[PDB]
Design a protein around this motif. Sequence first.
Motif, PDB file in Angstrom:
ATOM      1  N   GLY A  16       0.795  -1.207   0.000  1.00 22.54           N
ATOM      2  CA  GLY A  16       0.000   0.000   0.000  1.00 22.54           C
ATOM      3  C   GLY A  16       0.826   1.255   0.000  1.00 22.54           C
ATOM      4  N   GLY A  18       2.833   4.337   1.187  1.00 22.32           N
ATOM      5  CA  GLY A  18       3.540   4.635   2.422  1.00 22.32           C
ATOM      6  C   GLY A  18       4.086   3.422   3.147  1.00 22.32           C
ATOM      7  N   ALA A  19       4.087   2.264   2.490  1.00 19.87           N
ATOM      8  CA  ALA A  19       4.594   1.031   3.085  1.00 19.87           C
ATOM      9  C   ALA A  19       6.116   1.045   3.131  1.00 19.87           C
ATOM     10  N   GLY A  20       6.733   1.919   2.328  1.00 18.05           N
ATOM     11  CA  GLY A  20       8.183   2.028   2.281  1.00 18.05           C
ATOM     12  C   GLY A  20       8.797   1.464   1.012  1.00 18.05           C
ATOM     13  N   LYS A  21       7.983   1.280  -0.025  1.00 17.57           N
ATOM     14  CA  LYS A  21       8.461   0.717  -1.283  1.00 17.57           C
ATOM     15  C   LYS A  21       9.548   1.551  -1.922  1.00 17.57           C
ATOM     16  N   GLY A  22       9.265   2.834  -2.110  1.00 15.13           N
ATOM     17  CA  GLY A  22      10.223   3.727  -2.723  1.00 15.13           C
ATOM     18  C   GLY A  22      11.487   3.808  -1.906  1.00 15.13           C
ATOM     19  N   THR A  23      11.335   3.918  -0.594  1.00 16.69           N
ATOM     20  CA  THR A  23      12.477   3.993   0.308  1.00 16.69           C
ATOM     21  C   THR A  23      13.413   2.786   0.178  1.00 16.69           C
ATOM     22  N   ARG A 130       2.869   7.407   8.213  1.00 18.52           N
ATOM     23  CA  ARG A 130       3.981   7.713   7.303  1.00 18.52           C
ATOM     24  C   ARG A 130       3.577   8.669   6.179  1.00 18.52           C
ATOM     25  N   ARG A 134       4.870  12.297   5.466  1.00 22.71           N
ATOM     26  CA  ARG A 134       5.400  12.558   4.134  1.00 22.71           C
ATOM     27  C   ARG A 134       4.703  13.754   3.509  1.00 22.71           C
ATOM     28  N   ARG A 179       9.019  -1.758  10.716  1.00 16.62           N
ATOM     29  CA  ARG A 179      10.252  -1.794  11.482  1.00 16.62           C
ATOM     30  C   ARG A 179      11.051  -0.596  10.991  1.00 16.62           C
ATOM     31  N   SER A 180      12.223  -0.348  11.555  1.00 18.73           N
ATOM     32  CA  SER A 180      13.013   0.784  11.094  1.00 18.73           C
ATOM     33  C   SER A 180      13.449   0.502   9.660  1.00 18.73           C
ATOM     34  N   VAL A 181      13.828   1.562   8.958  1.00 27.73           N
ATOM     35  CA  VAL A 181      14.289   1.451   7.584  1.00 27.73           C
ATOM     36  C   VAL A 181      15.391   0.397   7.504  1.00 27.73           C
TER      37      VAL A 181
END
Length: 196
Positions: A16, A18-23, A130, A134, A179-181
Amino acid sequence: PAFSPDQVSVIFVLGGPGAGKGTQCEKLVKDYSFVHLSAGDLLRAEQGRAGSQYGELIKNCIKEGQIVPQEITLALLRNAISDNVKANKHKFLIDGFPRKMDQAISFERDIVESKFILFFDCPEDIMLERLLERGKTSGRSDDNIESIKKRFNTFKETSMPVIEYFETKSKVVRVRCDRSVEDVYKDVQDAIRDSL
Ligand SMILES: Nc1ncnc2c1ncn2[C@@H]1O[C@H](COP(=O)(O)OP(=O)(O)O)[C@@H](O)[C@H]1O
Ligand SMILES: Nc1ncnc2c1ncn2[C@@H]1O[C@H](COP(=O)(O)O)[C@@H](O)[C@H]1O
């Protein structure tokens, strides 16, 4: 397909907003030879392209959290993949695609069958915090609560069925987003090391 999985290796990175995909994809490109292609980015680029006949359509789809028609989406993705293969880039992390069954089947049948799907399993309350953060940090147009609710809805109703589809073909690798990055990245690396 336009390519065989030997010429072009494709890992769909799903989850979804803001799940952190791009990061995570951005970190992965530092350590791996993968090229990171973001469907959202490709769409946002076309939206602002001088002379684009899709400017308004994409603009409206994004604000409403709607899935832009596959014809437009696939064309942009195919062009980006082609430019890379041409430049001898054969491994791709395609983030945010496929988000609908039609584009999933069209992609795998016309372009190339994916290696595996990296799915960022993420609780919605986490994704929500997130995205609000953002929204303040970056100011993306759709990072507002109204559009965010629509994006979550689309994700559940439209995108999740795609995960279920690939899951039946045993191609989904789940990674916890909460969890953390750095800790998430460790699991992402482990998944990739095991999945190649
Ligand atoms: N594991 C994490 N913990 C905390 N914040 C994160 C984490 N991963 C990403 N973020 C962030 O939260 C937001 C969403 O991550 P992002 O990578 O942009 O998501 P996605 O591409 O899935 O929409 C960004 O502001 C980003 O910095
Ligand atoms: N794979 C896709 N197919 C169609 N529309 C998309 C796709 N990916 C992103 N979009 C859209 O562009 C917006 C932003 O995507 P993203 O940056 O990934 O959050 C999404 O909410 C949709 O409106």
